[PDB]
Amino acid sequence: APPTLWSRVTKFGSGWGFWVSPTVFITTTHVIPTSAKEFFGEPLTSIAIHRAGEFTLFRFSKKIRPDLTGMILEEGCPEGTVCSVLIKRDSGELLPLAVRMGAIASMRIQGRLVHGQSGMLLTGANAKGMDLGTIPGDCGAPYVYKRANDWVVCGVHAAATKSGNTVVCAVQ
Amino acid sequence: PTLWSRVTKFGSGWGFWVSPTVFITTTHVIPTSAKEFFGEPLTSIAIHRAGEFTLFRFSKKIRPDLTGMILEEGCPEGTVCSVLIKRDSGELLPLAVRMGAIASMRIQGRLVHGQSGMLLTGANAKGMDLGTIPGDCGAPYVYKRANDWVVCGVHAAATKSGNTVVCAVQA
Ligand SMILES: CC(C)(CO)NC(=O)c1cccc(Cl)c1
């Protein structure tokens, strides 16, 4: 995946978030530190927060990442789209996991209720474990795909089944 | 402890540590001029070649951090293998491959003998981290059986799509 998409993937709370633009940062609601009152040197009172279930968007009143171009964020993607989930792992290792995207879904995963766009990993027979599949610390990683001219981000990693291929992308 | 630590840059492609002393790769990626590999004189290395499959056995422990894994001659038809691709970018790209019969296949004008496979990414336009490229040769084919990982061969070739592949196998 292009270096300019990896540069946007930022370690955050118990997981990750993603810079859509110099002023817009997206993440999974449950990775946000619940005590936090300051983000990137800005107080809460200078930030517009848009929350839909497991999807959170932060809009800043100054350019926090002026090195970046604004890119397209969409509310999920068409059924059958193949996306990459841009996962960073132990020691500048980059893991762009291939996922075939499905229907909007509500599920119960490890007792928790989760809603977003479902998908199936295309990495192996079963993706149990960290070599072929996701771990809890991957939450907030972006789902991206190429419209063979440009790249689109269509949501953030919310949950995965224990012993399975199924993942959920939280969407705007 | 990870399978990915076993995938190592080698010659024009990659190879895989099966054990502290056993390394497997694709015959055509191996340097044709060498007096040592991994600091060990070629004098003390056993080389077993079968077509596009090569196994090296070293006289001392090169990777003492590793346990020995199961190596088999291919896998049953219908098995969904993972090809463990490493890229010079720093990307790790595990891709699902549905495995078919052992055959001699015509791939970009050459005959290649090994186990056929097709990627589950399928459609085409792999210009997205969705298919193989020539520099990926020697990457291992693995799958989970019970609690056990099995390595069943090495990446030897692919069609122009990068979606129809050949896994070179032992013996
Ligand atoms: C990435 C950092 C170091 C900063 O955002 N993460 C945390 O400080 C963190 C992690 C887990 C839980 C809570 Cl409350 C905070």
Author numbering:
A (entry chain A): 1 to 172
B (entry chain B): 3 to 173
Give sentences from the paper:
Viral replication requires a 3C-like cysteine protease (3CLpro) which processes the 200 kDa viral polyprotein into six functional proteins. The 3C-like protease (3CLpro) was named because of its similarity to the picornavirus 3C protease. It is a cysteine protease which shows a typical chymotrypsin-like fold containing two domains: a β-barrel domain and a β-sheet domain separated by a groove where the active site is located. The active site is characterised by a catalytic dyad (Cys139-His30) or triad (Cys139-His30-Glu54) and shows a strong preference for a –D/E-F/Y-X-L-Q-G-P- (X can be H, Q, or E) sequence corresponding to the subsites S5-S4-S3-S2-S1-S1′-S2′. The key role of norovirus 3CLpro in the processing of the polyprotein and the absence of homologues in the human host make it an excellent target for antiviral drug discovery.
Fragment J12 is the worst in terms of resolution, diffracting to approximately 2.1 Å, although the electron density is still of good quality. Screening with the DSPL library and part of the Maybridge Ro3 library identified 19 ligands in total which bind in five different sites, as illustrated in Fig. 2.
